[PDB]
Design an enzyme around this catalytic site. Structure first.
Site, PDB file in Angstrom:
ATOM      1  CG  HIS A 120       3.774  -9.346   8.508  1.00 57.53           C
ATOM      2  ND1 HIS A 120       2.162  -9.589   8.572  1.00 57.53           N
ATOM      3  CD2 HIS A 120       3.777  -9.136   6.917  1.00 57.53           C
ATOM      4  CE1 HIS A 120       1.803 -10.785   7.080  1.00 57.53           C
ATOM      5  NE2 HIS A 120       2.522  -9.446   6.154  1.00 57.53           N
ATOM      6  CG  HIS A 157       8.252  -7.327   6.850  1.00 58.45           C
ATOM      7  ND1 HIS A 157       7.743  -6.251   5.586  1.00 58.45           N
ATOM      8  CD2 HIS A 157       8.008  -6.957   7.950  1.00 58.45           C
ATOM      9  CE1 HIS A 157       7.379  -4.880   6.571  1.00 58.45           C
ATOM     10  NE2 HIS A 157       6.939  -6.059   7.697  1.00 58.45           N
ATOM     11  CD  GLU A 201      -1.305 -10.543   6.551  1.00 58.61           C
ATOM     12  OE1 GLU A 201      -3.058 -10.580   6.555  1.00 58.61           O
ATOM     13  OE2 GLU A 201      -0.549  -9.980   7.049  1.00 58.61           O
ATOM     14  CD  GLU A 245       1.450 -14.611   3.451  1.00 58.90           C
ATOM     15  OE1 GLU A 245       1.122 -13.855   3.790  1.00 58.90           O
ATOM     16  OE2 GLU A 245       0.959 -15.230   2.769  1.00 58.90           O
TER      17      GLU A 245
END
Ligand SMILES: [Cl-]
Length: 298
Positions: free
Chosen positions: A270, A228, A284, A268
């Protein structure tokens, strides 16, 4: 450099920490897209919350300007936000509906620049709140992250046009197609080598593009990593988030990519930033991660 990973807790759980940056004095600033707020963590670890004035705004990216103000994007509410040094939030509505602002950064002369992912435009806002926009040449390009290059132009990813975009203060837009087809560029940042470095979410590569537009690419070891964001570490290091693989990646010496597993179900990761010693990232799963390398011996 093997390592240490510490997790920190925000004031609430499940707040959806997403973007992250660090001030020159070491204060970490984060967007929290489920809680609809921005938080600052001081050196002493104390957290200050800045709830957004607009409900359900989907706060995404943030940046700290030269004057210490914090600027951010409200992706669902079609707004650019600003936290003054007095802690006061001011929001500016974008002129065209559903523009979906996303990446944000400071330009060469101090204005704040941003992408409008669904609007298919780059925007620029002055200290006095005047907004100006530049339409991209090809429909449906989905411009995503943006950063300031060493050439004083703004460099951004076009997630659905498979290209790196460059826009100057005078409005010259140039696009550089990526060699890997349909590679889905997302994060971009300035490397200490003065090139721009980006991630391909589908191509599963780290890319490097010179200010003259020359691209080279480096395959990420873990398949389907879904990288990401990316940030410069010390020297030629680039650190990136593997949101799909729940890892932190590092492209280092001799372009070897090292991967550090995050030890958390559905982390997760980011956003990512580096404060000079510590690599900070937003997960996340609702925590902030702090990764530090241990120096080598003999
Ligand atoms: Cl500017």
């Amino acid at each position: 450099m093997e390592f240490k990973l510490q997790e920190l807790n925000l004031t609430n759980q499940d707040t959806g920490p997403y973007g992250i940056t660090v001030s020159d004095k070491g204060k970490v600033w984060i967007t929290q897209h489920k809680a609809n707020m921005i938080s600052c963590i001081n050196l002493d670890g104390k957290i200050t919350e800045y709830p957004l004035p607009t409900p359900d705004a989907k706060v995404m990216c943030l940046t700290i300007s030269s004057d210490g103000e914090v600027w951010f994007t409200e992706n669902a509410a079609n707004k650019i936000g600003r936290i003054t040094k007095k802690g006061i939030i001011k929001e500016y509505t974008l002129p065209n509906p559903d523009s979906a602002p996303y990446g944000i950064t400071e330009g060469p002369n101090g204005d704040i620049w941003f992408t409008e992912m669904n609007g298919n435009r780059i925007g620029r806002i002055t200290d006095d709140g005047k907004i100006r926009e530049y339409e991209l040449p090809n429909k449906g390009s989905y411009p995503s992250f943006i950063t300031l290059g060493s050439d004083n132009a703004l460099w951004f990813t076009e997630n659905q046009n498979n290209a790196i975009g460059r826009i100057t203060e005078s409005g010259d837009i140039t696009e550089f197609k990526i060699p890997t087809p349909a590679s889905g560029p997302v994060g971009i940042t300035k490397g200490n080598d003065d090139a721009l470095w980006f991630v391909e979410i589908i191509g599963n590569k780290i890319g490097r593009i010179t200010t003259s537009g020359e691209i080279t690419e480096f395959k990420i070891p873990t398949p389907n990593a879904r990288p990401h964001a990316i940030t410069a570490g010390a020297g030629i290091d680039l650190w990136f988030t593997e949101w799909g693989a729940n890892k932190i990646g590092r492209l280092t010496s001799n372009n070897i990519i090292e991967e550090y597993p995050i030890q958390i179900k559905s982390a997760e990761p980011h956003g990512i930033c580096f404060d000079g010693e510590t690599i900070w990232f937003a997960m996340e799963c609702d925590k902030i991660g702090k990764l530090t390398l241990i120096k080598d011996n003999m």
